[PDB]
Design a protein around this ligand. Sequence first.
Ligand SMILES: [Mg+2]
Ligand SMILES: [Mg+2]
Lengths: 48, 95, 52, 88, 315, 100, 141
Amino acid sequence: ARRQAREQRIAECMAKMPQMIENWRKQKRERWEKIQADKERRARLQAE
Amino acid sequence: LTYCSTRKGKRKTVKSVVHRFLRLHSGLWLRRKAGYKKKLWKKSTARKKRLREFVFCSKTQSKLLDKMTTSFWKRRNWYAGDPYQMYHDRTNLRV
Amino acid sequence: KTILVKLVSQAGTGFSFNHKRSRLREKLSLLHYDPIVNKKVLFVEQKKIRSL
Amino acid sequence: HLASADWIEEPVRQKIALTHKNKINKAGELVLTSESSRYQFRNLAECLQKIRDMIAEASQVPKEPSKEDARLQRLRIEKMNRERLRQK
Amino acid sequence: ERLEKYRSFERYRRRAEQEARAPHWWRTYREHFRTQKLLERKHFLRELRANVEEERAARLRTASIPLEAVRAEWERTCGPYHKQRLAEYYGLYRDLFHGATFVPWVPLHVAYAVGEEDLIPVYHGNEVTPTEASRAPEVTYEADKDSLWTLLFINLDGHLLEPDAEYVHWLLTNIPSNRVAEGQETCPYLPPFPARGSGFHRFAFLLFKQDKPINFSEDTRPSPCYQLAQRTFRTFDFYKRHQEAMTPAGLAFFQCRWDDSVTHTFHQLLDMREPVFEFVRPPPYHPKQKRFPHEQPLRYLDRYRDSHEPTYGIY
Amino acid sequence: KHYGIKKMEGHYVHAGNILGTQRQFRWHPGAHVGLGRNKCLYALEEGIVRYTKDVYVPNPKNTEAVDLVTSLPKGAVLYKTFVHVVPAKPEGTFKLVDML
Amino acid sequence: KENEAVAPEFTNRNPRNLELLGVARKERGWATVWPNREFWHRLRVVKTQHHVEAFVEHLNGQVVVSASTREWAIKKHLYSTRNVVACESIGRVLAQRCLEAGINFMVYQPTPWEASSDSIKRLQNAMTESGVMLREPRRIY
RNA sequence: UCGGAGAAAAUCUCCGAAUGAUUAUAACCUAGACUUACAAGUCAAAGUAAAAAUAUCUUGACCCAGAUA
Ligand SMILES: [Mg+2]
Ligand SMILES: [Mg+2]
């Protein structure tokens, strides 16, 4: 019973793992966007 | 060390050796590495790998441990399925 | 200044490893290798171990 | 002797001869050996066992080609060059 | 400050490469490890330059070059010089003629017929399977009439027993002119027989200029010859015998691996068990075993053991 | 500490051996010589140690080296010291396994 | 049978034997220098003021296959020695010679600007079409 | 106590560390070596596994108590 309970929980978590990884990958993308959203996209825009 | 005991008149084992080292029948001694469970977060991955290993003892260290333990700890033990069964003898040793 | 945290795998395994974060920085999360699953999975912070 | 032997079914025999030609002697006998232990009991065991695997893999079709190992890539790439040059 | 500066990585790179090739006092890595023709060429260039369509295609980066014509021109004009290198690279000269170098001149051509009009050209360094070369190939070298010649095929690397040897697959002698059917068949054609697991054997096709008809009785072989042992042969001795009337003029060599046809050759006509070779590396180096391997891990004892199974001795 | 030349020129070195240790690049990796994290130099092939000067060309990407290299006197180029191990054995040999 | 006689150890003399097997040594050092020399063969493309040349050379320094626009046969069919088409065309010629010599696997080490150059990209396109591999396989240990 | 610079390796002349932020999250296993009284400390081919190579820059033993699985 322990092995099956251990195995099934991993399967469910692994099954949803791709979506969570995509989300984590997604967030960091937007985080970086904000970095250049003002570093050059806005700050330099006025410096013109 | 107790060389002659009051009750039995024998030497006595130092139970600090028995709880730290393994003696192979050939004469070698195994030990762990000091600090292998300490502050692992700040140790490099290569450093941790070195720490986890089972390591041999020098000739003088082995000579000391032989003095600190009695003969019973030097006998040949026939354990079924022993994981050190193959390490109790030396092979191809000319020296 | 900084703290020692315990990142825990979200793959359903109990695998965890310790990392450092800055008290100011938000809670941490990283992709790391899980030996039991033999795949990269998300590790999210659950508990603090000590303040280093 | 692979072909003469009747215990193996004929369809299997043809597949085995093609797949494992390298192990067939000039006399037509299938020579397999092992030298992995100090006990002949164990040595013979793999010899007998290898025969069983051969029949099964020949009995069961290996549909899957699997991934292409770097050796197969080298064989395929060098083989392709032969055709281009051979086009004469 | 007087000297200018490179100002470009490429200029420095080229200068550095040249210096390494030049000899130096200090040790270095390398130590240890006619007129009418020219005028004609210029006239063609002007004609090509004048062509607006050629310029139009070039400026549109759509132009292309016919490889077929260049290949024929390359063979006639400067191909032999390159052909000499690929013979030097493979060591043909240093093997057949103990380091003597002969420039090939005749653009020799060989091809193995496969069923129908699908000829496998045997160029220099080509890869040809033994199966395809089961039968003798077609040789064409435009000897012209009144042109005595001689043809030789050799495997260079082989002779399982003898290291410094080279079998002759077949030697046609007294070949009069281009035609080859008129050659005296001193040796019949043997199919390639490279042993399994022995790597790439290099086979070469060499042609000598035959000055005067010489009977090669000492070289004739009993046809059919299936006593492989007899095929033992070394060019140097053969050439030395006839060096007066034999001068090489052509080359063509391919390299082949083992193949199923090789098993057929070893059994059917060679009538012997086929040898199998495997690439064996030297055993790994281990420092001499010590009674006390101080500070060494438990793996130390495994390095010096021979048998992987337990022994019990007197028990 | 104890930075120095562990193996001197001409010595028969076995693979993995360490040849020299350095805080800064007194020597540079040559042929069949590897570079370690700490910049120590070890033998990648069993052979003989050899030290030789040679021209130095850096990776194009690094700005500091390309700039310095570029801003050099047209006439000549800078050099460096390299360490090489000369392999002393063939990779392997072919032997007769069986006659079938 | 005298035919059956076989020496215990074979002595395959073919210089390209181990390299073709993939088991021969490649230089693995030169970590601090550019480019790396872990190649059995290398392609060096040099653009001179009026001419473009391509070579294939072994580690020992002997050129094997050389294609240059200075060669007469290429020039008569080649409009301008220095051109993108010339770079593309010379690559095609080099490939066939490389195919002829049996050199299927090769190493090319361009510089960042050279790699980005359209002409070099076009030249590599021709080599890829011919089947010459610009990357060698890793050694077998 | 340890590290960096000079004297130049014996005592002298000076600066810093008991970390710091960045981050690609940096796996397991295993030849040969460095250093070293012991103890601790370094580098690393090959193989396998993840991914699509990379962690970059500048330290305290044993016992004994804990924490979670
Ligand atoms: Mg020690
Ligand atoms: Mg590795």
